[PDB]
Amino acid sequence: SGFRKMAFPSGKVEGCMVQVTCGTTTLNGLWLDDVVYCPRHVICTSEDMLNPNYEDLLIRKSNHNFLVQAGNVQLRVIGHSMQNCVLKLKVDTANPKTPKYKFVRIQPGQTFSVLACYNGSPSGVYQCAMRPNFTIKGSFLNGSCGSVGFNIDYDCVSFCYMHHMELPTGVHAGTDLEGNFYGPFVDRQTAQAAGTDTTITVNVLAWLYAAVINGDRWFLNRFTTTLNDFNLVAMKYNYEPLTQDHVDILGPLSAQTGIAVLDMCASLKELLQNGMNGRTILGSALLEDEFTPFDVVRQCSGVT
Amino acid sequence: SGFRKMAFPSGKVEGCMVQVTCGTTTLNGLWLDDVVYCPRHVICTSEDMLNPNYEDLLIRKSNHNFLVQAGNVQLRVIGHSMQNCVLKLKVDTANPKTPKYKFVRIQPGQTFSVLACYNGSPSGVYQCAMRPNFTIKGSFLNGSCGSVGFNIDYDCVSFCYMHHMELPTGVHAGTDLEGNFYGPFVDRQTAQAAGTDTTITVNVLAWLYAAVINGDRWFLNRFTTTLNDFNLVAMKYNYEPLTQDHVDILGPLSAQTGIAVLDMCASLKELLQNGMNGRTILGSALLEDEFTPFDVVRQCSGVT
Ligand SMILES: CS(=O)(=O)Cc1nc2ccccc2[nH]1
Ligand SMILES: CS(=O)(=O)Cc1nc2ccccc2[nH]1
Numbered sequence: 001s002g003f004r005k006m007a008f009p010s011g012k013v014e015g016c017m018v019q020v021t022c023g024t025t026t027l028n029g030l031w032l033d034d035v036v037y038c039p040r041h042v043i044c045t046s047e048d049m050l051n052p053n054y055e056d057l058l059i060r061k062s063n064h065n066f067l068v069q070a071g072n073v074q075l076r077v078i079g080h081s082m083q084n085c086v087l088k089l090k091v092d093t094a095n096p097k098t099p100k101y102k103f104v105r106i107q108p109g110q111t112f113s114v115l116a117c118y119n120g121s122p123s124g125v126y127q128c129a130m131r132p133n134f135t136i137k138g139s140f141l142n143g144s145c146g147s148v149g150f151n152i153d154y155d156c157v158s159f160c161y162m163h164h165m166e167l168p169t170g171v172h173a174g175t176d177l178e179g180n181f182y183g184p185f186v187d188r189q190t191a192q193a194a195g196t197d198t199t200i201t202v203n204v205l206a207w208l209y210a211a212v213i214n215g216d217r218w219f220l221n222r223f224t225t226t227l228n229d230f231n232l233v234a235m236k237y238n239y240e241p242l243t244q245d246h247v248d249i250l251g252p253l254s255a256q257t258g259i260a261v262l263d264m265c266a267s268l269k270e271l272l273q274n275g276m277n278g279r280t281i282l283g284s285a286l287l288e289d290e291f292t293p294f295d296v297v298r299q300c301s302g303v304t
Numbered sequence: 305s306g307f308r309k310m311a312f313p314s315g316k317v318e319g320c321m322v323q324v325t326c327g328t329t330t331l332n333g334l335w336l337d338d339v340v341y342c343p344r345h346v347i348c349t350s351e352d353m354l355n356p357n358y359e360d361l362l363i364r365k366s367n368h369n370f371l372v373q374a375g376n377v378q379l380r381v382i383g384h385s386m387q388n389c390v391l392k393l394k395v396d397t398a399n400p401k402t403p404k405y406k407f408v409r410i411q412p413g414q415t416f417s418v419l420a421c422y423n424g425s426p427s428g429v430y431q432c433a434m435r436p437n438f439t440i441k442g443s444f445l446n447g448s449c450g451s452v453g454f455n456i457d458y459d460c461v462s463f464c465y466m467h468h469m470e471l472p473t474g475v476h477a478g479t480d481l482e483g484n485f486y487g488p489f490v491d492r493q494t495a496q497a498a499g500t501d502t503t504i505t506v507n508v509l510a511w512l513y514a515a516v517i518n519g520d521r522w523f524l525n526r527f528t529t530t531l532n533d534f535n536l537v538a539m540k541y542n543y544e545p546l547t548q549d550h551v552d553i554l555g556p557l558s559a560q561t562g563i564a565v566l567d568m569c570a571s572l573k574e575l576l577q578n579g580m581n582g583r584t585i586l587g588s589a590l591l592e593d594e595f596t597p598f599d600v601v602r603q604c605s606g607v608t
Contacts, residue, residue: 001474004443006428009419024322115313121608124310125429137587139308143608170305170519215474275582276589283441285580285589302445304425 003210003282005290006299007113007125008152012084015097018075019120020089021067028117028158028175029068029089033100035038036068036089037177038146039164040082041187048190058082061091069120070095084179085164085187103177108132109200109240111292112149112160119143123128128161129203129290132240133183133195134183140162148177154304167192170200200289201239202246205264206296207288209253211281213300218279219258223266230265237272249293258298306512307586308592310603311417311429312456319401322379324393324450325371332421332450333393334463334481335436336402340372340379340393341481342450343468344386345491353493361384367393374399374422376573378605388483389468389491404460407481412436413504414545415596416453416464417603423447432465433594435508436544437499438487439475452481458608470497504593505543506550510600511592513557515585517604522583524563527570536570541576553597560604 006021020029020038024045029038041049061080066089068075078091106112106202111129116139128136128149140147140163149161164187165173171194173185185192212220231241247261254261268287276285290297324333324342330347333342345353347361363383370393372379383394410416415433419426420443432440432453444467445449449553454463468491469477477489489496516524535545551565558565572591580589595603 001445001470002441002443002476004428004441005309006420006430006431006443007311009315009318009426010313010317011426014313014315040524084351100497113598116310116606118606118608122315122607123606124308124603125313126308126310137306137308139306139310139603141305141604143606166305278579279592286584299428299443300445302420302422302447303426304426 001214003214003299006129006155007127008150010113010115010122011254012099012147012152012157012288013115014122015079015099016095017115017117017120017122019067019069021069022061022065026119028239029094030148030162031070031075031091031147033103034091034094036084036091038089039175039187040085040087040179041145041164046189052188054082070295085175085181086177086179102156102158104158104160105150105176105178105180106160107248108134108294109203110160110184111203111290111295112151114138114149114161114163115147116140116144117147127290128291129200130182132198132200134185135153135167135173135194135197136161138172140166140172149174161272165192166192169194196238199237199239199287201234201242201268202249202293203289203291203293204239204268204287205246205250205289206243206253206293207259207265208264209250209257209259209281210296210300212257212259212293214282215282219267219271219281221267221270223270224260224263225266225269226262227265230269233269233272239272252297253293305518307518307603308457308593309431311431311456314419314426314429315393315455316456316461317419317452318405319403321419321421321426322398323371323373324454325373326365326369330423331447332424334452334466335372335379335395335399336376336405336594338398340395341390341466342393343466343479343491344389344391344483345449345468346370346391347504348604350493356492358386359597389479389485390466390481403521406460406462408455409463409480409482409484410434410464412438413507413596414464415507415594415599416455418442418453418465418467419451420444420448421451431594433504434486435475436502439471439477439498439501440465442476444470444476455486467536468575469496473498473563478580479496480494494539500542503541503591505538505546505572506597507593507595508543508572508591509554509565510561510573510588510597511595512568513554513563514595514600514604516561516563518586520585523571523575523585525571525574527574528564528567529570529573530566531569534566534573537573537576543576556601
């Protein structure tokens, strides 16, 4: 029993983190096979970040200007290319610790683990969600860029995020491992404001199922609702609309608990309208939305 | 910026997890050098757990009855001994992945990372605190016993916890790596009720400093207090008494922020008396107490 915000074990990703330095800028790279992936803004000064022309800045860079260090050992750079907002540094040594891996572009509401790194060294691991406004709420200091987000399915690491930017509001923006930003964000130090940070309804419902499984039951009520009725309330509270696809995804938790998805919606509706009244659910005083239905099943069933 | 509940990177501990089976019981062991450490209740049936005589049960066990598997490779057991509530299984192979390590017995209010495992395979990592009643609020299913808690200082793993028991209230009890339970708990399926789960005041204050550093400032007020006045309010709210030692430990955060510890106490006093009024601090609607002052400094400074 018990339900925690749980990250994936980080060892497979620790074995991929390297330091990348270009001139006076040091950040992290991801070493898979004989390629090191890092944010292209490694080539920028803080001054450059105001209005960078990456193609123009990159002309002044040679392979020997990209210093890549794996632990205390230097890697030889034999090629570089820019793909969207990432650089791919070809090195002459395949990472001997390269796990089975994939690059995946996640959807808003999907969760992942972040291995926060500085100078190519892992500092900590924590669980994130892709917000509906395509930001993440991370923990990233200067030097953390190129830290990655990932999921693990048994022995395959799906890399989904690389850290690039902090917005003036202290939320985070980054790319997939093809270097495409999530959402509208750019790697420039400019006016970039995030949209509404809506609540991931399907994840809240998953977490309420988790709560029932783990004996937190006080919020269960005598009511049901419909998707349309629920959605009128979601809209009012800046929750994401619940779709039949979401109801289908919650089917296994519904089955395990015997609580119909629409009955759990009506519990959530009352919690939104009435608040928690100073009560807690799984140790939280707000409705938690960074567990997916898959996360809840995984943690409640003990997948390794 | 941003402040997350962050675990230590788990790779160094992943490389130490093995499966231990005795008869029909499978749980996890920790393989360091040529010793595998596991809960002594591996020798029990569920029936045995009602009133186990461990010395008597152990007489019926030989080295060859302890099946130890590291990945898909069997380890040869050449000795076993019971130390308090752990078994030490001597194997004929030193763990090649043994990190620098120490065994430490932590104090209530200290935090640590847990690597939740099943069948010797890591499932997830999360951050815990030793509660003032010597329980932890973990995430542990059948098969998770022998999962460990740890801190890392650069390259040295300090192991502080091994998982043994779930209480009927769904909180967790375990031992240090010398097999001594934290608190009054025993490895028997009996009436064991936890005491008051008081709030770790010094950790709340650390987290309020973290909040100020990360731009959450609304709760700062025009008031100060004294330790004695603060402690009258702590007592009323089931907070741990704040000592001068705690004030001293908060000195670096006080210095960084320029907020006197006693002024932050007076902010906490008002939050206790007035509540949050539907506001959040670092994304929480309750006062978080599973960050130590050391955790806040580490995360705010980016230690690897
Ligand atoms: C990337 S490569 O050098 O073209 C081929 C390769 N990929 C590897 C991954 C791990 C170990 C050796 C490996 N050789
Ligand atoms: C424990 S032992 O067999 O007595 C000595 C030992 N400890 C080691 C740790 C890592 C690799 C080889 C090692 N040999």
